[PDB]
Design a protein around this ligand. Sequence first.
Ligand SMILES: C[C@@H]1N[C@@H](CCCC[C@@H]2N[C@@H](C)[C@@H](O)[C@H]2O)[C@H](O)[C@@H]1O
Length: 440
Amino acid sequence: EIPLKYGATNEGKRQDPAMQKFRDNRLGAFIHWGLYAIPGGEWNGKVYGGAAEWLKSWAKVPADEWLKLMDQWNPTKFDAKKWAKMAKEMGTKYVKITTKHHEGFCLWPSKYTKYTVANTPYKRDILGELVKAYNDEGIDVHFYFSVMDWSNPDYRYDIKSKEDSIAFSRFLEFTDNQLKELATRYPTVKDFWFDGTWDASVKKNGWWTAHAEQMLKELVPGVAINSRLRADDKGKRHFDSNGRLMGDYESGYERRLPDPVKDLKVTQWDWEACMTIPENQWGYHKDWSLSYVKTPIEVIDRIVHAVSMGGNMVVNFGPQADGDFRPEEKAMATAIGKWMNRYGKAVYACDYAGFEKQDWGYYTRGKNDEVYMVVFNQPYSERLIVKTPKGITVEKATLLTTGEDITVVETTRNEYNVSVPKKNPGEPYVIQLKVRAAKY
Ligand SMILES: C[C@@H]1N[C@@H](CCCC[C@@H]2N[C@@H](C)[C@@H](O)[C@H]2O)[C@H](O)[C@@H]1O
């Protein structure tokens, strides 16, 4: 067992009310909005296929020229109340907002740099408007923050000289300052989600990552901090040199998910996944025909998958430069909202059920030991196999929407055939099981 000063703090899952809320929420939205929304993946007449928020990198644009996009930042159609209504209608219980992406442009008027919304034609504190509007709908607000900053010349990718160390030390102070500023300007913030912490410079400064976590927790009671921030004494990221999770929840599942049979270890800690609608576009890209775009059901499948393994899911949106959402994203939010309004008893405040995975879909477990079968793949056999853990029996099955009774036939010790509904629901659907544990 290795000695560590900057390794894991928490033993298991936090069980204070603020973390229980973080968890019970389950479904969130991600907002990526920054200067990248203006070119929308096109630079100097060339459309790049890579992630639009990385266009500065793909098109090799220098900082001074990239940040000159500030002069066109004037989202006339922006309306924070509209945004919050859209999130409410989607059924999202929280929103994660890009306060500052890699480009360094801040969506709040930071006093620690000139590359902020204050020095744009628009001028207004976009972040503060969003915080207020989402909080007015009862939606928690989480802050995405990129440590890596392409606008600050003191940033370093690695520490290869005493000059690199000096510059980077200044950079970390600048970062602390921005963070303290965010925490105190917007004290309803529930989470900081760090990105851009993979460079060797950061891995070599584990002490700073632990310090940032302690500092923010002192400033914001009950705040959650993601594992991605954290590096230990040895530069091991997410989980420390003793394999213990750092931060409050695991945050590595980006555009992919743990395997439902092979990655059951994830059920031992809190975790959150994120995803994109296209293959890899977080910021607004003007041409979505360049990669596969997920359908609503494909998105709903990933949401439920996450919850079935004890994790949250955050679906991403990349608003237009004008401050409105593109029509594909409006259609997505409305379709997810419709399905959650009907079946969201199986999602909100649900967790891992402890049952062996079956082909038809996923199980989730409610707060009162309800076991929901969320069916995505309808068997031609008309029978949904349910294999119970030791000592567990199924006393009843009920179609969630209609209350109708569903026949349960015992086929072996520990296994049943739960019939499909008499009328095919025509969409992914929920059967609620009543289970009993012998003297869950
Ligand atoms: C949440 C998403 N994170 C950003 C993509 C991060 C890519 C991470 C890759 N892995 C590192 C080790 C680097 O090689 C970097 O390319 C996206 O722009 C979104 O903000």
